[PDB]
Amino acid sequence: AIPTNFSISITTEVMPVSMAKTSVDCNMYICGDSTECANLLLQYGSFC
Amino acid sequence: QQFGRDVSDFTDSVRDPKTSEILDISPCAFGGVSVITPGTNASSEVAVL
Amino acid sequence: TVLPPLLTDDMIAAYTAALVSGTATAGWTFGAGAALQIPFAMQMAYRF
Ligand SMILES: *[C@@H]1O[C@H](CO)[C@@H](O)[C@H](O)[C@H]1NC(C)=O
Fold it and tell me: Where is this chain glycosylated (chain B)?
C-alpha cells in the first residue's frame, strides 16, 4: 500500500526557557531589622 | 476595625487611634548595592547601582 | 510505602508487542505514520 493523497498539519509544543530570577535580603527576612537579630547573626558569619 | 493586614500577615495599614485617619505603612528603604568599574587596570573611578 | 505504577506490566507488555508486530508487518511505515502493509524483505530492502 502506497499513499496517494495526503495532508499537512501544524502542531504546537511549549517549553520554558527562563525562571523568575529572585533575590532575598537576609536582614529583612531573618531579622526584620531588629538590632538584636543582627548581632546574633555575626555568630553565624557570612552565611548570607 | 483598627488595623489592616496584607496578603501575608504583616500589618501594612494603620488607622490613627486619635484622628481615625487610616494610613499605609511602607518599608523604609532597602535593596542591593552593585558597583560598576572599568577595571583597576583602566581607571580608579566607579559608578554605583 | 511504595505505590504500584499506573501503566501495569501486561500493559507494558502489550504496548511492547505492538512495537514488534507492527515493525514485522509494516516496518518503516509503522512509525512514519499510518502503518502500511508490505513484505518484510521489502522492508529490509528499504532499510538496506
Ligand atoms: C595596565 O597595568 C599595567 C601595569 O600593571 C600597565 O603597564 C598598563 O599600561 C595598564 N593598562 C593601560 C591601558 O594603561
Answer: 41
